[PDB]
Amino acid sequence: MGSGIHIRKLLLLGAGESGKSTIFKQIKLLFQTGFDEGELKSYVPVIHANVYQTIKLLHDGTKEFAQNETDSAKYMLSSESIAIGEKLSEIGGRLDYPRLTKDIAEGIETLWKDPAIQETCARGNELQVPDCTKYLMENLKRLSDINYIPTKEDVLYARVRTTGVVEIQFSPVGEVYRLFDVGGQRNERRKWIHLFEGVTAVIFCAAISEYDQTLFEDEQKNRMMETKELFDWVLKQPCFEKTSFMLFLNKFDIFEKKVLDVPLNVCEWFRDYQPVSSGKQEIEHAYEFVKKKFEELYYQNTAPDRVDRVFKIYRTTALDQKLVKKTFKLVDETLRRRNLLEA
Ligand SMILES: Nc1nc2c(ncn2[C@@H]2O[C@H](COP(=O)(O)OP(=O)(O)OP(O)(O)=S)[C@@H](O)[C@H]2O)c(=O)[nH]1
Ligand SMILES: [Cl-]
Ligand SMILES: [Mg+2]
């Protein structure tokens, strides 16, 4: 007879921007209380910063593209849009938390309509233009409103690179989960190893939509290749001999749009992909091909004294509250059933 308390450690791992914190926020929303008014307002400075960050990357990329174009007026901005442009890049560089006003939103919304910016957005995958860009650019009136209060959707979009280690505790529906969120950019990974003891499950986030993108850390490195190599590295860690692996193939909502426009074949790993249909048939073909690449990667890298550990794959969109709820229930049943097996 002991205390009766069973705390199981769960670890979010994955590359920078893969969706870990987003999953983390969903867990708090599902298994604890919903964000109260003060908590919602605390994200305004982040959301506003994101808007200036996004327009800056577009404004800078246009300058990059114009220098390499020698016989085109393609990436030359208007005069008004330059008067707006330069103003914003000044503000966003001297302030970590630039405020989005009615007037600033007007300039951005005007700068967004410039064909030079649009020509830049079209080549966004060659830049670090975030996926949420269209969303932000379409909600400026709401976001710049004097009494702006962020929605759950806003907060989940809100993007901060994680630089510390945060823990939450929850029991689904004396069994408790202790869930850790940590940064996944290369420099933050130095923090990983000290978290690796006594882990019941690793929840590894793989952003499957990034197959035509390059890293923040190294703009020459394909993002999907990094995820491949990173997952590979996690799987070989001695501490994880008995740890369950829950693989979230995340950003499926983005992957769905992208695959019918950008062939999987642009990523080295997916070089031999052959399309077979159109529409939803093709999307599912492409998904199953990616999933199979990850499965094979898993078995290729799991040695015999580890092959018995649990391994599951889930297709996720971290912004989708109902899907994360249903995904987490499956994960919990699997972990419970397994712990009950080794008893
Ligand atoms: N469309 C879409 N966007 C997503 C999805 N998952 C995460 N995002 C968005 O991607 C961005 C990065 O997500 P985030 O949760 O911060 O990644 P991270 O793994 O925590 O990144 P880091 O801390 O290691 S730098 C956020 O703006 C978030 O809203 C998704 O499934 N679909
Ligand atoms: Cl099972
Ligand atoms: Mg994070």
What does the H/E/C string look like for 192-218? CHHHCCCEEEEEEEEEHHHCCCECCCC
- Ligand 2 centroid to 156 CA: how many Å? 30
The residues, any chain, with a CB within 8 Å of residue 268's CB and separated by 6 or more, are: 222, 225
Output the six-digit token pair for 320: 């989708």
Is 20 near ligand 1, meaning CB less than 6 Å away? yes
Query: Which ligand 1 atom is nearest residue 22's CA?
Result: 15
Distance CA 249, CA 324 (A): 12
Torsion over CA of 71, 77, 82 and 85, rounded to 10 degrees? Answer: -110
The residues, any chain, with a CB within 8 Å of residue 61's CB and separated by 6 or more, are: 120, 123, 124, 127, 129
The topology (CATH level 3) of 36-161 is GI Alpha 1, domain 2-like (1.10.400)
The residues, any chain, with a CB within 8 Å of residue 179's CB and separated by 6 or more, are: 10, 11, 12, 24, 27, 167, 168, 169, 170
Our mutation pick for probing the ligand 1 site, out of 11, 13, 22, 25, counting the most ligand atoms within 8 A of Cβ, is 22
Residue 94 identity (one-letter amino acid): R
Distance CA 19, CA 250 (A): 7
Bridge partners, 175 (sequence order): 6
- Closest Cα partner for 242 from 301, 193, 335, 309? 309
- Closest Cα partner for 252 from 209, 286, 290, 218? 209
- Closest Cα partner for 159 from 307, 277, 52? 52
Output the six-digit token pair for 297: 């990667």
3-state secondary structure of 312: strand
- Closest Cα partner for 10 from 204, 220, 178, 252? 178
Report the half-sphere exposure of 38 (CA within 13 A, side-chain side). 0
Distance CA 332, CA 241 (A): 20
**Residue 181 designated active-site:** yes
Asked if 150 contacts 47 with a C-beta cutoff of 8 angstroms, the reply is yes
User: What phi and psi values does residue 11 have, to the nearest 5 degrees?
Assistant: -130, 125
Domains 8-35+162-335 and 36-161 agree in fold? no
**Residue 210 designated active-site:** no
Total count of residues recorded for the chain = 343
**Other beta carbons less than 10 A from residue 31's beta carbon:** 17
The topology (CATH level 3) of 8-35+162-335 is Rossmann fold (3.40.50)
Distance CA 90, CA 101 (A): 15
3-state secondary structure of 173: coil
Asked if 49 contacts 97 with a C-beta cutoff of 8 angstroms, the reply is yes
- Closest Cα partner for 32 from 176, 157, 158, 151? 176
Query: How many angstroms is the resolution?
Result: 2.3
What residue spans define the domains of the chain?
8-35+162-335, 36-161
Asked if 178 contacts 8 with a C-beta cutoff of 8 angstroms, the reply is yes
Asked if 148 contacts 141 with a C-beta cutoff of 8 angstroms, the reply is no
Residue 302 identity (one-letter amino acid): T
- Ligand 2 centroid to 334 CA: how many Å? 5
Query: Which ligand 1 atom is nearest residue 161's CA?
Result: 25
Distance CA 316, CA 294 (A): 15
- Ligand 3 centroid to 340 CA: how many Å? 32
Give the determination technique: X-ray
DSSP-derived letter for residue 14 is -
Give 243: exposed, middle or buried? Use CB within 10 Å, 0-12, 13-18, 19+.
Answer: buried
Residue 301 labelled as part of a binding site: no
The residues, any chain, with a CB within 8 Å of residue 21's CB and separated by 6 or more, are: 160, 162, 181
Our mutation pick for probing the ligand 1 site, out of 13, 17, 217, counting the most ligand atoms within 8 A of Cβ, is 17
Is 143 near ligand 1, meaning CB less than 6 Å away? no
Asked if 242 contacts 307 with a C-beta cutoff of 8 angstroms, the reply is no
- Ligand 3 centroid to 82 CA: how many Å? 34
Is 254 near ligand 1, meaning CB less than 6 Å away? yes
Asked if 162 contacts 182 with a C-beta cutoff of 8 angstroms, the reply is yes
| DSSP letter for each residue of 112-160 | TT-HHHHHHHTTGGGTT--TTHHHHHTSHHHHHSTT----HHHHHH---
User: What phi and psi values does residue 66 have, to the nearest 5 degrees?
Assistant: -65, -35
